[PDB]
Design a protein around this nucleic acid. Sequence first.
DNA 1: ATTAGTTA
DNA 2: TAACTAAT
DNA 3: ATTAGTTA
DNA 4: TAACTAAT
Lengths: 255, 255
Amino acid sequence: TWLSDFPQAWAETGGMGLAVRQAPLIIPLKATSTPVSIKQYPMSQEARLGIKPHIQRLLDQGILVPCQSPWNTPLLPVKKPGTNDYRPVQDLREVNKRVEDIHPTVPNPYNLLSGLPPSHQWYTVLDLKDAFFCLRLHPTSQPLFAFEWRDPEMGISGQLTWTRLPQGFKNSPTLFDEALHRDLADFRIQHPDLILLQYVDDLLLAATSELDCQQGTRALLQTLGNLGYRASAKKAQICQKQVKYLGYLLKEGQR
Amino acid sequence: TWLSDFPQAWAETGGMGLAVRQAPLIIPLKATSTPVSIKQYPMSQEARLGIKPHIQRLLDQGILVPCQSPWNTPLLPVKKPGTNDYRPVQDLREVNKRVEDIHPTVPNPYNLLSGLPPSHQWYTVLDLKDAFFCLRLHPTSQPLFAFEWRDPEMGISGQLTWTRLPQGFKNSPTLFDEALHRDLADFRIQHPDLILLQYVDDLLLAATSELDCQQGTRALLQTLGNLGYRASAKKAQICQKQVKYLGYLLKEGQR
DNA sequence: ATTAGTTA
DNA sequence: TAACTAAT
DNA sequence: ATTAGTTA
DNA sequence: TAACTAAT
């Protein structure tokens, strides 16, 4: 039961993550950018009730905080089902347009896999839960991602914003990927034999013997939990010779 | 009055033309071609009355003759005005598709004009009237261009066809152009100095002195009339230093 | 609720 | 040009 | 009356 | 995809 050996490493028992070694991120704007404030589109009580719990939880976790900002983007009530539960999706497109571009350093899955040697048949796959939220946003950049929120009967003043790298921000994947690479550089050095593939929040650890893939996995989980990241114990694929990774099925140095 | 000096050369007084030196044309079909017979689209009495005179005249001139053929294309009643006189336009497209292609030897106007020297400022422009009809169609090729014709009260059996190169046939421009070039080759040889440009039925004669452009024009008209072609005395532009040719205005070695 | 892009 | 298609 | 091609 | 545009 790896779940018991490494409590801090699993989202199930380690609590929300926070990459303690990473300095809060500063988001540079384009040279000519000025704040854009888009009024919130009227939302139905149904959508609001559906979204409320999520907002409340984020506030209690400190991921969302009240604020007053010249920036504002609309919240979209998206129901994953065909007519069930909602989830808040923020339309950060006008903000993305005003933020300075950075080089896309995340390798496409195909090329990433080309780094998998035939010798390592034992793989481990971990998915980091709420990856972006583990990265802090510098207070000077937080106002950029503000949106409107209310409760027709008592509630928050008006706007809330993120204290962590938000979903929907064009640079979140790249910044997370680069941050985790910095945090796992030492681990790679301490395990010259192991093969560690990273695709934003999806990790594939490779090894020759179940002993390696096993001892290596223990070190990774311990390392991850220690750095402040959290993996999904639910979806975790430990020391297998066949696993699903990035939409592929790895089985015998194949796919 | 050039009209009196050369009666045979003008459509106004020479009668319908007929290139006596040109052998009746044989139209080769593509390797796999089979006859196409498209029934005549119902025509209104108005259109028919409008077209009748033209058909009658062509028959009297021997340009149209009765026939029975496995080929048939529809006649289209086209009124050049917005609601006036009609003219018969035959849709030979399905026939054009079955006829073997030939190389397009007619030069585009731009390139043709590039053959105009600065030295020749005196030009003459002649337009051959009913050019295609001056070329005979071999009896073996005539059936190809058949169409339906009737007179609700006495008339022609059913189909008529052309005995001359018809309008609407994809190769008519090229074949006429090549035929006239053969008929005017000698004239070019007998007038090394003169500049003769041909664009299907549009002729431009160039010269240095009004004497040349004049004596040369007399020889051309005489030659043309003698060969069986006919120019429009109406639109004729004799020995001028400015003339309209192929949509251009020639004035001083310009345009 | 919008929109950048692709298809009909 | 109108419809789709995906995306935030 | 149809149609091959180009634009909306 | 619908409309045009030219052409026979």
